Structure 1
Amino acid sequence: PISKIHARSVYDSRGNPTVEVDVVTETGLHRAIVPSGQHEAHELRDGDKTQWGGKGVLKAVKNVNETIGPALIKENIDVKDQSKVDEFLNKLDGTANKSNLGANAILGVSLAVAKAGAAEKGVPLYAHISDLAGTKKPYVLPVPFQNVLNGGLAFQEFMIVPDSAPSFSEALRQGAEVYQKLKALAKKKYGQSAGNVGDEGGVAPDIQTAEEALDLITEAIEQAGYTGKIKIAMDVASSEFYKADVKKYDLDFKNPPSKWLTYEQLADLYKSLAAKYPIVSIEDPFAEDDWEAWSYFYKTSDFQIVGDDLTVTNPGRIKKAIELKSCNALLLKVNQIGTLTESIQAAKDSYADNWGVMVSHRSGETEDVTIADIAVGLRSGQIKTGAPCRSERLAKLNQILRIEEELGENAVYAGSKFRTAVNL
């Protein structure tokens, strides 16, 4: 039985407070940190403008210590029964968007209990999650989708995809070597300041077009010697520059014209880009409620089309995207829905339509490495957890290296089959 549940405030990778939760059982202390968090679950912030600019989480922490913690202990639920725990947490909150107790308060307890549940089983968390998710063996290690060039030019994320590598360990080496070439290249062509990094550890040179970013990544891949072995992925994050009033997308939404694209015109740009560069995945190509545009694009595209703001890890929105045939992959952010169990349901719903699933970090991350075990446990074959820079990003990649070494031949690298890794 649970003996202690205690939460505290800690700092995420951008210097903002977030919730860390301790759950103590007979097996020891089990700890999880929640990452930073329009349709997603409601994160509770203090809103006191004199403290952390209003971004405190003292109220969410208090909800864990005074309400969730004492209620869950008294209920005495087996920590291995994750679905029962999360059902009780949502019953305790009682709101659809988790606005009573806070999505950050609920998720922190949900993830720390999951680690207590695995430990009572005597297995690593990824094995516990595979049990919960019903995913088959051997374990599959994910392809790291590495955001080495940070934007948002309009497009937000430019990722390298080392899918040809024979192992996860080698894919990381290739990505690390490409990133080092890219950083030198950015400094050479754009000045010393272009080597400084964005929130997720990629370089952010002052560049104008998508083709400029892709050319720089292409040259770095060639300098590293991996042309043809490393693919490219993008997160457009097009909701950032959609003007719903006129139904047009403003690629120059940073400078305050008639250069605004319809979704047919924007789709033309993606098709031109995908036919020139080895782009294998595009995330949020259209806005979070521009369902018509997504369905139009899905019909012609043979590459991965990832919902992020479209789906917000929400089984209800996933169902709509399946029915309208709007996308074929889910970006899975556990704190967009608020419990481990609903996150797993989101994954299973996607798998049922043969979607890919890409387990994802947030731009405000921590030293917590839960999503590495989630990606392996879900057999997703894909993870998005940053450039190989800043340790809130490397910590997840380091954790997968430990899992890889621990599993040996009982794990396979998803490689080029990342879109179908669950059935690999």
Structure 2
Amino acid sequence: PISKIHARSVYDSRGNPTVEVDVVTETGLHRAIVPSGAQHEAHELRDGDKTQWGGKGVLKAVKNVNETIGPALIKENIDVKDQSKVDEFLNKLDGTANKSNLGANAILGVSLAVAKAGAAEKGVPLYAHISDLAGTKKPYVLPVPFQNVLNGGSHAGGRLAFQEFMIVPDSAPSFSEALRQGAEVYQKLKALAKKKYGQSAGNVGDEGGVAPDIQTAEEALDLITEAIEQAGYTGKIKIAMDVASSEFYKADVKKYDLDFESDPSKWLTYEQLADLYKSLAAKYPIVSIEDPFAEDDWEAWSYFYKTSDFQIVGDDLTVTNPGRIKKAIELKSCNALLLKVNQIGTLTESIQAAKDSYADNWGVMVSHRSGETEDVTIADIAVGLRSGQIKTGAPCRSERLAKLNQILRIEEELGENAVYAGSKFRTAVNL
């Protein structure tokens, strides 16, 4: 049984507080940290004291764990291996749809730490425990890393509207080789950004990529193309994009602004914006595009889904919510889910969201948040869900690479009992 549940405040990769939860059983201490992003999302609880951390404190969510959730869960005396019963009891304590009573960050912290307690009691690592929960088959599939190497949009100075530009090393024979290839391409890109845009262009962003003053999407894609050629991996490494188009969708006119100080004549309809995506995908090896249209522009998604053979990933459209996923399935809006566990609040609901996506032959890309920690839970999640896709930043900044290092340890531990997803990442759950 659980002997102690204790939470505390730690700092994330941006320097903001977040929740860390300890769960102690006979097998030892089991610790998890909650991420944080920068929507119909799960309501995370912030203190709001503008004299402490700029109002970003989480003392209230920590207190809810220590004073309310903890003692109630210990008295309930649920088997730590039964994640469904644990998370059901956590949502019963909260009692709200968006987890606004106790806080999504407080609930998830207990949920993930109890999951590691359940894994430790079974004598298996977390990814094996999650595979039992999700019912994924063996051998384990190691995910292809979608490594963000260049950033635009609201996180850059140029007119580039797209947010994230990633490299996809899917042709590598192993996850270990896919990491070295991505690492080498990233070094060639950082040196290119320095030589082409100045020494300051090498300073990284929140996720570890560069963000120089770039004006067009092809200018960013050309720079990535040049970095892949220098490393000698042309044709073996693909490209992914996270447009984050909710940042520049003017809902009043149903038009998209590619310079969100702009002109009113170049504002793209979703038919015009899709033509630019189709043109880029016919020129560059773009195999995955995330959030190409706004979070509530369902008609645009379905229009784009009908003609596209590449992966169409929902993030702000789906917010890891099975209700939004069911609607996206019924309207044929996307074919992949970006899984952010803190967008829904519990591991069980996160697994259910992945299962609902698999039922429509979707891909699942387990993702990080822009504010990450040294916690590596999502590395075991991507392996346990047999997702074949993980998105956890550049090969830079350790809140990003600690996830990749963990998969290296999982890769070495499993050996023959694990296969790399490869080019079959969109269907890895049935690989």
Residue 257 of structure 1 deviates from its aligned partner by 3.1
Could you tell me which runs of 5 or more consecutive residues in structure 2 were left unpaired when the two chains were aligned.
154-160
Aligned partner (choices 401, 407, 415) of residue 422 of structure 2: 415
TM-superposition CA deviations, 1:138-157 (whole Å, max 9, x none): 000000000000122x1010
Residue 256 of structure 1 deviates from its aligned partner by 8.9
Q: What CA distance in whole angstroms lies between the structure 2 residues aligned with 1:257 and 1:10?
A: 45
- The 10-residue stretch of structure 1 (360-369 or 253-262) with the greater mean CA deviation from structure 2: 253-262
Q: What CA distance in whole angstroms lies between the structure 2 residues aligned with 1:25 and 1:202?
A: 40
Q: What CA distance in whole angstroms lies between the structure 1 residues aligned with 2:72 and 2:369?
A: 29
Go from structure 1 to structure 2 and tell me whether the alpha carbon gap of 1:188 and 1:254 turns closer, same or farther (over 3 Å shift).
farther
TM-superposition CA deviations, 1:22-49 (whole Å, max 9, x none): 0000000000000004111000001111
Q: What CA distance in whole angstroms lies between the structure 1 residues aligned with 2:176 and 2:27?
A: 31
Q: What CA distance in whole angstroms lies between the structure 2 residues aligned with 1:36 and 1:354?
A: 29
Go from structure 1 to structure 2 and tell me whether the alpha carbon gap of 1:188 and 1:3 turns closer, same or farther (over 3 Å shift).
same
Go from structure 1 to structure 2 and tell me whether the alpha carbon gap of 1:407 and 1:219 turns closer, same or farther (over 3 Å shift).
same
TM-superposition CA deviations, 1:302-344 (whole Å, max 9, x none): 0000000000000000000000000000000000000000000
SS in 1 for 2:167: strand
TM-superposition CA deviations, 1:123-172 (whole Å, max 9, x none): 000000000000000000000000000122x1010000000000000000
Q: Which residue of 2 aligns with 1:150?
A: 151
Question: Does residue 389 in structure 1 map to residue 390 in structure 2?
Answer: no
Q: What CA distance in whole angstroms lies between the structure 2 residues aligned with 1:405 and 1:208?
A: 42
Residue 255 of structure 1 deviates from its aligned partner by 5.8
Q: What CA distance in whole angstroms lies between the structure 2 residues aligned with 1:261 and 1:178?
A: 33
For 1:23-42, list aligned pairs within 5 A: 23-37=23-37, 38-42=39-43
TM-score between the two structures when normalised by the length of structure 1: 0.99
Residue 259 of structure 1 deviates from its aligned partner by 1.7
Residue 258 of structure 1 deviates from its aligned partner by 1.9
TM-superposition CA deviations, 1:281-322 (whole Å, max 9, x none): 000000000000000000000000000000000000000000
Go from structure 1 to structure 2 and tell me whether the alpha carbon gap of 1:117 and 1:254 turns closer, same or farther (over 3 Å shift).
farther
SS in 1 for 2:7: strand
Residue 369 of structure 1 deviates from its aligned partner by 0.1
Q: What CA distance in whole angstroms lies between the structure 2 residues aligned with 1:7 and 1:16?
A: 16
The alignment of Structure 1 onto Structure 2 pairs a total of residues equal to 423
Q: What CA distance in whole angstroms lies between the structure 2 residues aligned with 1:310 and 1:367?
A: 28
Go from structure 1 to structure 2 and tell me whether the alpha carbon gap of 1:14 and 1:256 turns closer, same or farther (over 3 Å shift).
farther
Residue 109 of structure 1 deviates from its aligned partner by 0.2
Q: Which residue of 2 aligns with 1:49?
A: 50
SS in 2 for 1:386: coil
- The 10-residue stretch of structure 1 (307-316 or 35-44) with the greater mean CA deviation from structure 2: 35-44
SS in 1 for 2:235: coil
Q: What CA distance in whole angstroms lies between the structure 1 residues aligned with 2:210 and 2:98?
A: 35
Q: What CA distance in whole angstroms lies between the structure 2 residues aligned with 1:274 and 1:254?
A: 28
Q: What CA distance in whole angstroms lies between the structure 2 residues aligned with 1:379 and 1:206?
A: 38
Q: What CA distance in whole angstroms lies between the structure 1 residues aligned with 2:263 and 2:216?
A: 17
Residue 239 of structure 1 deviates from its aligned partner by 0.4
Q: What CA distance in whole angstroms lies between the structure 2 residues aligned with 1:55 and 1:120?
A: 35
Go from structure 1 to structure 2 and tell me whether the alpha carbon gap of 1:254 and 1:74 turns closer, same or farther (over 3 Å shift).
farther
Q: What CA distance in whole angstroms lies between the structure 2 residues aligned with 1:131 and 1:150?
A: 37
TM-score between the two structures when normalised by the length of structure 2: 0.98
TM-superposition CA deviations, 1:350-405 (whole Å, max 9, x none): 00000000000000000000000000000000000000000000000000000000
Aligned partner (choices 308, 314, 324) of residue 321 of structure 2: 314
Q: What CA distance in whole angstroms lies between the structure 1 residues aligned with 2:62 and 2:425?
A: 37
Go from structure 1 to structure 2 and tell me whether the alpha carbon gap of 1:254 and 1:342 turns closer, same or farther (over 3 Å shift).
farther
Q: What CA distance in whole angstroms lies between the structure 1 residues aligned with 2:193 and 2:377?
A: 32
Residue 254 of structure 1 deviates from its aligned partner by 6.0
SS in 2 for 1:296: helix
Could you tell me which runs of 5 or more consecutive residues in structure 1 were left unpaired when the two chains were aligned.
none
SS in 2 for 1:208: coil
Q: What CA distance in whole angstroms lies between the structure 2 residues aligned with 1:47 and 1:257?
A: 38
Q: What CA distance in whole angstroms lies between the structure 1 residues aligned with 2:71 and 2:253?
A: 51
SS in 1 for 2:304: helix
Q: What CA distance in whole angstroms lies between the structure 2 residues aligned with 1:174 and 1:203?
A: 18
Question: Does residue 205 in structure 1 map to residue 212 in structure 2?
Answer: yes
Question: Does residue 18 in structure 1 map to residue 31 in structure 2?
Answer: no
Aligned partner (choices 258, 263, 281) of residue 256 of structure 1: 263
Q: What CA distance in whole angstroms lies between the structure 2 residues aligned with 1:36 and 1:329?
A: 22
Go from structure 1 to structure 2 and tell me whether the alpha carbon gap of 1:86 and 1:273 turns closer, same or farther (over 3 Å shift).
same
Go from structure 1 to structure 2 and tell me whether the alpha carbon gap of 1:320 and 1:103 turns closer, same or farther (over 3 Å shift).
same
TM-superposition CA deviations, 1:180-239 (whole Å, max 9, x none): 000000000000000001110001111011000000000000000000000000000000
SS in 2 for 1:172: helix
For 1:48-127, list aligned pairs within 5 A: 48-127=49-128
SS in 2 for 1:374: helix
Q: What CA distance in whole angstroms lies between the structure 1 residues aligned with 2:71 and 2:123?
A: 26
Q: Which residue of 2 aligns with 1:346?
A: 353
Q: Which residue of 2 aligns with 1:281?
A: 288
SS in 2 for 1:261: coil
SS in 2 for 1:280: strand
